[model samples]
Target: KVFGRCELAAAMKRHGLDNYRGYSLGNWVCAAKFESNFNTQATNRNTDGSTDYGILQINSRWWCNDGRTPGSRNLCNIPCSALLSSDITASVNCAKKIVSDGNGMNAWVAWRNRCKGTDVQAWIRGCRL
Candidate 1:
């Protein structure tokens, strides 16, 4: 069966992000909601009629365009899809590369510090993981 929001959250927990606090999950959920309305099999069409597929809104053309090998034609293949489908560790690691590298998490840390009215980097500094 296809996974949903709660199942996704459980998958995240299993992937080692035990804290699971704040807007991390919220950010992913919001992106998913905006991108595909949480439909795992959703696909979008470009003006020229090309396609984008899967949850997380992966664009097959961009990530897999050759069609000659694995991850070459689509984002729905094994391993990569297994990682991207519902694995938070894989997703976050990919998000880190595509979104922040590390700065996004740092920004979250800064937000926490500002909320407490403390040093802007304090929360990041004290972050356990």
Candidate 2:
């Protein structure tokens, strides 16, 4: 399912990810926007043959299995497709762990390149809650 920015933010807040894994909500929020624009089914292939899945774009190299990709660590131990659901639970959980695993917020390139040290409050502007 697709979610608008505010809707996705509300969901993230409900998931308690506004500060999950030692990062602020802006960390994941802007990363998701840059990576997938809140499309739960989003996927992108890396030049190294890894694929990113879902809104948070969990990478197949270490976090999930897409069946077509071999040598995946599957650290999150989930089928990558599980993240394509609008529910976002698996994606959020996996991202939390991924960010904590020394990747920091740098686990997401979008965060490193686009969100870090920027004023991301605009991303949540006009949301009622």
Candidate 3:
């Protein structure tokens, strides 16, 4: 599913991402835009044999168990496949774990490269909460 900008913003807010780990909802909005273009089924397979899954583009290397990523810790304790569904609860919960691990939003390189150090509020401009 491809969520519209406000649709995704509201979804993330409902999932408790607003100001999570000191990052604004708009920060997440901007990051998600660049990460997967708001497509819930987005997937990116890496040359290292790991895959990034779902809206957040979570990696199989450490966050999920794909059974193919060598040395996967499966820190989220869920199947990597769980992230591809339109239901975002699993994805959001895993992201919380990543942020709580002290990685902050920097866990996503897309965020680091595109969203950080910018006026993230622009991503949510004119969108009603």
Candidate 4:
């Protein structure tokens, strides 16, 4: 598992997520922390017949298929299980695409509910962004 704050920020930078959409790098880090605490295996089953998965908590409703669920949008073209991998590539790409399409980072409930209007920089407090 990744340590909180600085460690996660550095990892995200190595993955090229720091300033991809003209948003702050801390936005990505805090969103991941609040969404899944950087746990790639994280999953939250929703009442909407979809699941939120990975550090990005991507919803199966429109992003990826969980393989058990039918009629999913699967816009990311990868299995939802792929997002659950320790590797962050699939999840990060999908999340970036999502931000570009939706209301920026507001696509993530955790971002709206937790990461917004607060000390977002704390997620990357010690990182050299």
Candidates' lDDT values, in order? 0.43, 0.85, 0.91, 0.82
What TM-score fits each model? Answer: 0.46, 0.93, 0.96, 0.90
Give me the runs in candidate 4 sitting further than 4 Å from their true place. none
Top-lDDT candidate index: 3
lDDT of 2 at 23: 68
Q: How high is the lDDT of residue 61 in model 4?
A: 87
lDDT, model 2: 0.85
Instruction: List CA RMSD, all candidates.
Output: 9.3, 1.2, 0.9, 1.5
lDDT of 3 by residue, 1-129 (tens): 899999999999999999988888999888889999999999999999999999999999999999988877899999999998898899999999988887788899999999899999998888989
Ordered by TM-score, highest first, the candidates read 3, 2, 4, 1
Pairs that collide in candidate 1 are none
- Cα RMSD, model 4: 1.5
Clashing pairs in 2: none
Report the Cα lDDT for candidate 3.
Answer: 0.91
Per-residue lDDT of 40 in model 2 = 96
lDDT (Cα, tens digit) per residue for candidate 4, span 46-100: 9877899888889998889887666879989988888888778888789888989
lDDT of 1 by residue, 1-129 (tens): 245656654454455433333334445444544455556656665564345444555454444342323334443332335333533454444433434333443333223333333332322232323
For model 1 the local lDDT of residue 122 reads 27
